[PDB]
A paper describes a structure:
GmPOPB-S577A (the higher resolution of the pair) bound to the full-length substrate (35mer) belongs to space group P21 with four monomers in the asymmetric unit. For ease of discussion, we split the 35mer into four regions, the 10 residue leader (residues 1–10), the 8 residue core, 6 residue linker, and the 11 residue recognition tail. In all 35mer and 25mer complexes, the enzyme adopts the same “closed” conformation in which the lid (the propeller domain) sits on top of the catalytic domain. In both 25mer complexes the N-terminal residues of the substrate (IWGIGCN) are disordered; in the S577A–35mer complex the N-terminal two residues (MF) are missing, while in the H698A complex only the first N-terminal residue is absent. There are no large differences between the protein backbone positions in the complexes with the 35mer and 25mer substrates (root mean square deviation (rmsd) of 0.48 Å over 720 Cα positions for the S577A structures). Substrate P10, the site of proteolytic cleavage, is positioned for attack by Ser577 (the Cβ of the mutated residue is 3.3 Å from the carbonyl with plausible geometry). Tyr496 is on the opposite face of the carbonyl 2.8 Å from the oxygen and positioned to stabilize the tetrahedral intermediate from attack of Ser577. In the 35mer complex structures, residues 2–9 adopt a helical arrangement that ends up exposed to solvent at the N-terminus and makes few contacts with the protein. In the 35mer complex, the core and linker adopt a tightly packed arrangement that is wedged between the active site loops. We propose the arrangement of and interactions between C-terminal 25 residues and protein that are seen in the 35mer complex act as a kinetic trap, which can only be escaped by dissociation.
GmPOPB is the macrocyclase responsible for macrocyclization of amatoxins, eight amino-acid ribosomal peptides with the core sequence IWGIGC(N/D)P. Amatoxins are cyclic peptides further modified by a characteristic sulfoxide cross-link between tryptophan and a cysteine, and hydroxylation (the extent of which vary). GmPOPB is an unusual enzyme catalyzing, depending on substrate length, proteolysis, or macrocyclization using the same catalytic machinery. The protein contains two domains as observed in other POP enzymes. The domain containing the putative catalytic residues (Ser577, Asp661, His698) comprises residues 1–81 and 450–728, and the other domain is a seven bladed β-propeller, comprising residues 82–449.
Numbering used by the authors:
A (entry chain E): 3 to 13, 15 to 35
B (entry chain A): 4 to 225, 228 to 727
Amino acid sequence: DTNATRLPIWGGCNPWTAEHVDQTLASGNDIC
Amino acid sequence: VTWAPGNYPSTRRSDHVDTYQSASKGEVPVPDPYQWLEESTDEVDKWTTAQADLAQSYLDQNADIQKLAEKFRASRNYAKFSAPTLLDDGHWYWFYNRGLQSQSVLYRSKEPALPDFSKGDDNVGDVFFDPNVLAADGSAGMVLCKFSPDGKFFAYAVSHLGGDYSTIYVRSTSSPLSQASVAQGVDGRLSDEVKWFKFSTIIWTKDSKGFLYQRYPARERHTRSDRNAMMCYHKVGTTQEEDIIVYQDNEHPEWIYGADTSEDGKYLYLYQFKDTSKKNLLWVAELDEDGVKSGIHWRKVVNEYAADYNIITNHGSLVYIKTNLNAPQYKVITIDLSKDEPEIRDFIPEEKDAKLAQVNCANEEYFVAIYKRNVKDEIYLYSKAGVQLTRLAPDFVGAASIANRQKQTHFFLTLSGFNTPGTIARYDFTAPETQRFSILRTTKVNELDPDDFESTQVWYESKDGTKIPMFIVRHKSTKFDGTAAAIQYGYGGFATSADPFFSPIILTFLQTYGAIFAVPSIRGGGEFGEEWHKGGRRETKVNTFDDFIAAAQFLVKNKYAAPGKVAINGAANGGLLVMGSIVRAPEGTFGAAVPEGGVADLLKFHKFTGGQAWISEYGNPSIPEEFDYIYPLSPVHNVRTDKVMPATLITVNIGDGRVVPMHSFKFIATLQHNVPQNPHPLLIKIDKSWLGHGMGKPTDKNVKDAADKWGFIARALGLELK
C-alpha cells in the first residue's frame, strides 16, 4: 500500500496495465 | 511525413563514456552516445517533435483506427459505481460515473437508509462532492479522500497539472461541492491547506480532531528528488504552520513512513520502509487525553528489516497482524503487549499452497479473509476463536476485495474478472442464517455480452523446468487451430500479481478480430508468495524474461495462436519486460511490441528521481558483483545489428515523474541506429501534456490512445475489419 505508491507501475488497487483505467468499482472500499 | 525503412530522424551521437567496475572483468568502459536525451533542451524538443510526427503520419495511413475508436467509445459507455459506505450521520455515500466522465462523482443518499439502487443513482442520491469542478478548466484531480470517523468532515488530496506533490483540503460534510454550489457562492471549504503530501494516505485519529499524513520539505523552483520524509499530524481548523512532526529520521533520509490508528482509540502505529521490498519496521505508542503531540513515546516492537507486518485490529493489548515472517504465503499472528517481552503466536496458520492476501475485522469479533489460490481469489468468514466457518461466493472466479467498518453489522465484497464487469455483494449479520449473503448491484455493460467469452487457465514449462499457469480469454467462436492472433500482457516484478480484471476494450478487440488474450503468471510477481518474487529478482531477474518468452512460444507450439502473430504489451516494469524480451527472444517470436513508459537503462535507473528504491528489485549497478548480472540484461546495452525486430510502438508521457522518459528515448534511438533498414516500423509516440502527480488523462484522450495502440497491433499482425 504506502510502499506500492512508488513502484514503477501504471497507476492504487493494483493497476498494472493501461486497460485498468476504470477504478470506480473499488474506489469506495476505504473512505472512512 | 512518410514512413519507409531507413527514414528515421537524425539523432546526434555524443562521445560520452562511463566507467563501471566488474567483478569478473575489472574496468569496463561503456559508451553512452545518447546521454544528451536525459536532458530538457531545444535540441531534445526538435527530436521529440520529429519522432512524434513520424509516428502520427504512420498511424494516419491506417483507416481502421478511427473505426476502433468508435467501437471502444461505445464499449466504455455504461454507468459505473462503487460499494456504498454508511457514515455516523445515518447516510450512505458512493461514487457514480454516468459512463464517460473523466472523474467519478461522490453521491450521498437522500434518506438515511440503504438505497434500492435499481431505481437509479439520481433518484436515490444527490451530489455531495464533484471532483470535476475543483478547477474551472478541468486541470485538477482528486487523488484520494477520507471521511472522519464521526462523519462530520471530509479530507481530500488534490493534484494540479505540472505538479510533483498533492495538497490536502478539508470541508464539512454538510457543505457539498457541485456545479450549483460553485455558481452560487463561496467554495464552502475550511481555510486549511496541507501541502507537500506524497506517497501516503490520510489516517484520522478516532476522536475526529485531526489526521496523520506524510509530507516532504518545501522546495523553491530552483532538483527533482523526494528525500527527508516526515510523518506529520494536522489538527482540523488550523493552518499547516501548527502541524506536529510525529516522526522523521535525518540519519536515513531515503526511508519513508506510514501510520494506522486503532478503532478503540488506544494505539498509534508507525511503519518504516527503506526501499520497495516488502519489509517494514513497526512501532507502537499508547494515546491518552493529550492526543497526538511531539515527543511521543515509541515502543519498538519490530526494529529490524526482515518481514512484512500490517495491523488488522486489536482487543485490549492483543494485536492481530498479517505477516510473512517465516511464512512466505502469509499468515495471521497475535502479539500480546501486556508482557514486557511481547509473546508472539500463530492465530491463522500459513497455508503452504495459498496466499493470504487480505484480512479485515467485521462486526467487532469476526474476520473476513481473502486467499489467492492458483491466482484466483476465495473468500472465507472466521470466528473470534479462529475457526473457519464458511466460504462466501463459492462459484466466483476472479479478483475480490472487502469494504467495511469494524463496528458495523455488515460488510461488502467487490468482485470482478475477465467476464465479470463488477458485482457488489452484501453480508448482513442481523438477518436470519441462510439469508445473510445477497447481491446489492451488478454492473450492466453496453453492446457486449460477457457470456460470449470463455476464460481458462493452462500450464506451460519454462526453460529451467518450472511449471507456470497462464490465463487465456477468447470470444467463443474463435478456434484454437493455429490461426488466431494473440495479445500477451505482463508486469513481472515487485511481488505484484497479474490478477484477473474486466476490460470492455480488450473484449471488444477479441470479438472484432477473433484474437485471444493471454496473461502468464511469470516469476517476479507475487501470485505464489514471496518465493515466486524471489524467483525473478536481482540475480534471478533473467527468469522473468525466460518465463515470458516461453509463454509466447507455447501459444504457437500448441496451436492457440498462429506463428508470428503474438503481440506483447506492458507498462513501466512491464515496459522493461517487453523491451528486454524483443532483444533476447529468437527472431520472429513476436509480431508486434508496445512498451508503455518503460525502464530500459538498467545501469542508470538509480540516478533519477525515485529509482534508488528499485535497487531491491534490479540490484545495484555500482557494486561489481551486481553489475555482472545487470549489464547482460539492460535493454539499452544489448541491441544488436543482426536480428530483425518486430513492429514496435513505444509510448511515453513527457511529464512522467516515476519512470523518466529518458529510458524510452535512449532505447528507440539505439534501435533506429542499429537496425535502420528493419522491414517493420520502429516508432515512438510522445504525449506532451505534463500530468500532475497521481492524475490520469481525460476519457476522450484515453479512448483515442487505445484506438492507436490496438490499431497498430492489428495492422502489424495483418488483421482486417470484416
